[PDB]
Design a protein around this ligand. Structure first.
Ligand SMILES: Nc1ncnc2c1ncn2[C@@H]1O[C@H](COP(=O)(O)OP(=O)(O)O)[C@@H](O)[C@H]1O
Ligand SMILES: Nc1ncnc2c1ncn2[C@@H]1O[C@H](COP(=O)(O)OP(=O)(O)O)[C@@H](O)[C@H]1O
Ligand SMILES: OC[C@H]1O[C@H](O)[C@H](O)[C@@H](O)[C@H]1O
Ligand SMILES: OC[C@H]1O[C@H](O)[C@H](O)[C@@H](O)[C@H]1O
Ligand SMILES: [Mg+2]
Ligand SMILES: [Mg+2]
Ligand code: NA
Ligand code: NA
Lengths: 391, 391
């Protein structure tokens, strides 16, 4: 036991049956959207940098039907969601716009509806099921937004691009969820392809598909199953810290600041500010190197870069915690572990570990043994992004 | 005027309609797969080179229904498909494979059925309609193959990779149409994204999606209305002349040969084979430079590299015709045109012209006046790849 990862046909069946019960008929329409692990390139997306995430086999499925009455009627089967697990509300009009409210889980859906670029949208009934753990740092939020977006497309086709949909999901997260994320989670949930990671250039929005499918390789995800109080909190503080440092250096973003320019201008910025820029500018470089390493088959080089990334996030960006540090220190101790680090926004959530497929069983036993807390594990391949399911 | 480009809703309705008439019921399943234009990197894909295609709004729509009796029943509405435009034939069995026969157009479907990797596959009825001009160098052939494959996936899920679907369609084109194509046409049909070009590395099969986000940049396609059939052309001879040069220099392919190496090895190959290989080696270098130019907005550079592509295809590879030559010279005389070149296999078909959007109307009048024949015109955006359409 690593945690089981239901396949789509299973999640679809569970969603259909829960809808049949709730609404009294079979649903007409279905879609899926994955969760996400970031292999490397943390706190770079809102700095116009480089990220290398892959989509997981963990996913949100959303089934539903149009209505003729202009209503939205929702049910989520996730415990983890704040109560009530059901909500109904009328579609926004040019006269009354939707509003963030409680239950907080519905905000993600209301936000996507509120910014959906096409019209006219009918009402709908829908059930959500998820295998993404809510609030585990594997991006259940972007899964839900992108599932919601893809579903609305089945009611009312858009005329825009992948990146425009990601930006609609991003704005919904900003205005309705109150969380000023970059573009990474929405982008990988939309753009994943199985047996690949995605080098996303968050400035050009150019994407490269980097093969990550060798039977002698595994990616292991360790849920710390913790979430400290600085999550809601220091993420916006860091994002503001980065924008200052860029202004002080005459730079549109930290993407335009070369690592050698930064060293030779510490005196223009706080000692705290300097350590933040150093992380971001180095991580961008590490992410470019790591992508080339992963294509080459150089797991050792990739693993070193993962660890260098962890040290940087721990000491220079200070978004690690004791629990993530502990879980990374246990992982590197295991023979066959190429590297390990804190993934997502941090202050808790998950570590990602790259290792020999043969060592995963040992690696899971050693990390459980050497972690105070109760840890959960996913052995996860690179998955496809958001799909329509024909019913 | 640009020739208008039917949207999917309209191709779908012409397909529902011809399906109802032919088979006396509504179809249950639908798919689309686009044609493509190659921006630069011609006759490199089978030499393990680089190409930069985008998918088109021109597409093949296939609608159909599982059958009970283990037969395949097909209709196409394309004028230009050899008679008969309808046929039935039994599914391949373990006892006996499909074989290429008459009519030539159905070899593309038979081949994809023969090589489709998942079982069991039921009989089916299907109609094919297309906005892709048959024989025009916009890959009507790969559009047909990939539409068929995406359809079979609706009858019987596969569980390989996007890449293995393209190599099935390629396999079908080699063995059933006897046309030894590279992987480009099938890959772009599968992998397209609207508002992107696709840089394909045909050695490693790595892909980048390059944003075409600029409303002041147009792509104009000019059909010469001289038809190629690539099978019976000098295409297989070019491919073999490239192979004999690689073999002579001890290279796995011409991707492994630099210009300077080819130049010192003249005494190893014929005058002709040297010229063919010099086009290929040159064209690989130019496609990398072109991607770099496009990435920084240097359209004048991109256009000069396209003109060099065209002179290399005309003089060293010898796959142009007097008609493509006149269409290119005529587009180059127009202000706001960055570059123009033949696209696809050659011997006829289409040119591709990159130009200021505002110049498109002048450019269409000028090329038509200065063309000895009758040109048709598509003003083209980057389009989505192959898709399921839920009925
Ligand atoms: N399937 C779901 N059903 C209901 N709410 C969900 C679902 N998936 C995500 N959510 C919402 O998203 C929140 C988790 O997002 P967040 O705190 O950003 O963590 P993460 O994105 O890492 O999982 C939940 O608290 C809930 O409000
Ligand atoms: N929709 C269609 N219906 C029937 N045949 C088709 C269709 N699309 C493509 N074809 C077949 O593909 C052939 C064209 O292939 P080819 O000569 O390689 O040209 P292209 O560059 O258009 O792909 C036609 O001769 C016909 O056999
Ligand atoms: O890599 C840091 C990461 O953090 C969170 O997961 C956000 O959702 C992303 O947008 C990104 O900033
Ligand atoms: O670039 C030339 C081009 O010609 C045809 O369209 C083939 O299908 C492609 O594979 C490629 O070889
Ligand atoms: Mg989140
Ligand atoms: Mg063809
Ligand atoms: Na433990
Ligand atoms: Na003319």
């Amino acid at each position: 036991a690593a945690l089981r990862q239901p396949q789509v046909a299973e999640l679809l069946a569970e969603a259909r049956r829960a809808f049949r019960e709730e609404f009294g008929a079979e649903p007409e329409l279905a879609v899926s959207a994955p969760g996400r692990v970031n292999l490397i390139g943390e706190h770079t997306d809102y700095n116009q940098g480089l990220v290398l995430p892959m989509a997981l086999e963990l996913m949100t499925v959303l089934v539903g039907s149009p209505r003729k009455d202009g209503l939205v009627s929702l049910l989520t089967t996730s415990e983890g969601a704040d109560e009530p697990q059901r909500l109904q509300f009328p579609l926004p009009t040019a006269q009354r716009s939707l509003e963030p409210g409680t239950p907080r889980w519905a905000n993600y859906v209301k936000g996507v509806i509120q910014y959906y670029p096409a019209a006219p949208l009918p009402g709908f009934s829908a059930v959500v099921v998820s295998s993404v753990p809510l609030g585990g740092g594997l991006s259940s939020s972007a899964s839900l937004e992108v599932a919601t977006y893809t579903f609305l497309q089945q009611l009312c086709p858009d005329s825009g691009t992948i990146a425009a949909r990601a930006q609609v999901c991003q704005q919904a997260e900003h205005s309705f969820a109150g969380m000023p994320c970059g573009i990474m989670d929405q982008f990988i949930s939309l753009m994943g392809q199985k047996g690949h990671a995605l080098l996303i250039d968050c400035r050009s929005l150019e994407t490269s598909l980097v093969p990550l499918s060798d039977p002698k390789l595994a990616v292991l995800i360790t849920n710390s199953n913790v979430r400290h109080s600085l999550a809601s909190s220091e993420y916006p503080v860091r994002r503001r810290q980065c924008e200052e440092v860029a202004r002080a250096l005459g730079a549109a973003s930290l993407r335009e600041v070369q690592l050698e320019e930064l060293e030779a201008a510490r005196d223009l910025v706080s000692k705290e500010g300097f350590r933040r820029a150093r992380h971001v500018v180095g991580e961008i470089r590490r992410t470019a190197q790591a992508a080339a390493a992963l294509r080459r088959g150089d797991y050792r080089a990739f693993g070193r870069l993962m660890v260098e990334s962890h040290r940087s996030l721990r000491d220079d960006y200070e978004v690690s915690c004791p629990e993530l540090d502990q879980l990374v220190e246990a992982a590197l101790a295991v023979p066959g572990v190429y590297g390990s680090r804190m993934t997502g926004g941090g202050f808790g959530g998950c570590t990602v570990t790259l290792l020999e497929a043969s060592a995963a069983p040992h690696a899971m036993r050693h990390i459980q043994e050497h972690y105070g807390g109760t840890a959960t594990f996913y052995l996860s391949q690179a998955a496809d992004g958001a799909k329509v399911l024909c019913l």
